[PDB]
Design a protein around this ligand. Structure first.
Ligand SMILES: CN(C)S(=O)(=O)N1CCOCC1
Ligand SMILES: CN(C)S(=O)(=O)N1CCOCC1
Lengths: 266, 265
């Protein structure tokens, strides 16, 4: 890992591991999600913003960054043993939050094999509840960001900004009774964001996963799943195959996540 | 990763990832288990395998884990480089062994060690079997000839018989199921999943105030994709010892049994 020449982005190479791949000997979308999160964490560390990726006024008001939206598009999943180079950068979205974008490339050819975008909001670190975003904690990190607009999804009306509807009962498919284990928690005993992607895909029938490849995943994070919570994952086909997804707590039916996935025949 | 000079062992360096660590900002025992499995995989690849010999493919025979023993003196911190050395040894008709030594890359100090017992099984019938002399000669050329042991000790805890837990268990985690992330490239539950499931019945107060030093785990049967497992634990003991039992909900069929040793932070 190393910051690029202008110090406005970070790049890192990963060799795909035997246990990180699926039945097609290529990296799963959850492995990709963890690789995106790891290169995000090393970019914050390399510029002096790690203690959580936080700024000086955030540390004082006790605010942390939390994911509100994750959008990934994969054109080619890396094979077991292949080297994948990822480039990451951040940009402010005014006083509404921040964005982190990624570009995945094949190290051998330099060809783009995927791309991601994420929306981040402020949250009180002690209570774990959402709080406003002010310009007080804005100028302190914008010098480590590209100045002109730079997006992984620049195109007008692109899939990453599409409004997601809420799934109406009954769901076509479901996986009920999902619970997090210690391996699903992060260093601060909180459920890893990549877990929710896995839980979302659990309600997709195996026949689909065996005959199709996942091209697009958009996921909105409404509420976090606590260590002792139990989640149901619901899916209904809306179509290439398209699915509408809903993660909710088993007891009260409180929404934790909503999303959409797009799959293509192999 | 690279085979050592005599081509009788393999070494690899791993940089610890942000998502691979626990509450102490050090690698979890499951992360270590996956690192052991990955360096095992690359050692088999570097010598010609894709760990099945030519004669084993014809007879529909695979290697399966029967025991896993890990001792950790120091878990690597997030960002640290951990060097692992792995090798294999024959166990005659019984099966094979794969050992590991974990070291700090900066000091060369041993921070942990592991051992594993492997047995031959027919893929179709699931029935375990003794190693024939034809198969034995194929892999014996890749093992050190003067046996190398990770656990040399005359009465090492890696060879101790593990009893079966009697109901009622002191503690339990009920209704554990595998998700797709828990499966390997052949749609089978990863061996590291069972370690995680075993540790789920350990109370959080113990995990927060103690560090895991030793884990021995016997693999009796495998959990299929649609199975549901219960994890049982009873304290048997500064140092804490636990007896573990993983079993299916549907009938109470044993899949794993084990022991863990923890020490106050
Ligand atoms: C500038 N960094 C690399 S950052 O994107 O990680 N981050 C921006 C805002 O939050 C604090 C740090
Ligand atoms: C020689 N390899 C690295 S090995 O240890 O994977 N090997 C021994 C067991 O049977 C065949 C495969």
């Amino acid at each position: 890992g190393s910051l690029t020449e202008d110090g406005l982005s970070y790049k890192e190479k990963f060799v795909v591991r035997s246990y990180e791949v699926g039945s097609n000997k290529t990296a799963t979308v959850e492995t990709i999600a963890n690789l995106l999160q790891e290169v995000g964490c090393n970019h914050a560390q390399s510029v002096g913003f790690s203690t959580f990726a936080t700024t000086t006024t955030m540390r004082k008001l006790h605010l942390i960054w939390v994911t509100a939206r994750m959008h990934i598009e994969i054109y080619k999943y890396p094979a077991w043993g292949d080297v994948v180079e990822i480039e990451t950068w951040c940009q402010s979205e005014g006083r509404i939050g921040t964005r982190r974008d990624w570009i995945l490339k094949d190290s051998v050819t330099g060809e783009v094999t995927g791309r991601a975008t994420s929306k981040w909001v402020m949250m009180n670190q002690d209570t774990r509840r959402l709080q406003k975003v002010s310009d007080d904690v804005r100028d302190e990190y914008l010098v480590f960001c590209p100045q002109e607009p730079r997006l992984a999804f620049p195109e007008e009306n692109n899939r990453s900004l599409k409004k997601i509807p809420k799934l109406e009962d009954p769901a076509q498919y479901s996986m009920i009774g999902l619970k997090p284990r210690r391996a699903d928690l992060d260093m601060n005993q909180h459920v890893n964001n990549v877990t929710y992607i896995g839980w979302v895909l659990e309600s997709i029938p195996q026949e689909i996963v065996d005959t199709h490849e996942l091209q697009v995943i958009t996921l909105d994070y409404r509420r976090e799943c606590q260590q002792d919570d139990v989640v149901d994952s619901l899916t209904t086909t809306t179509s290439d195959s398209q699915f509408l997804h809903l993660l909710r707590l088993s007891g009260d039916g409180q929404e934790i996540n909503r999303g959409t996935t797009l799959w293509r025949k192999k």
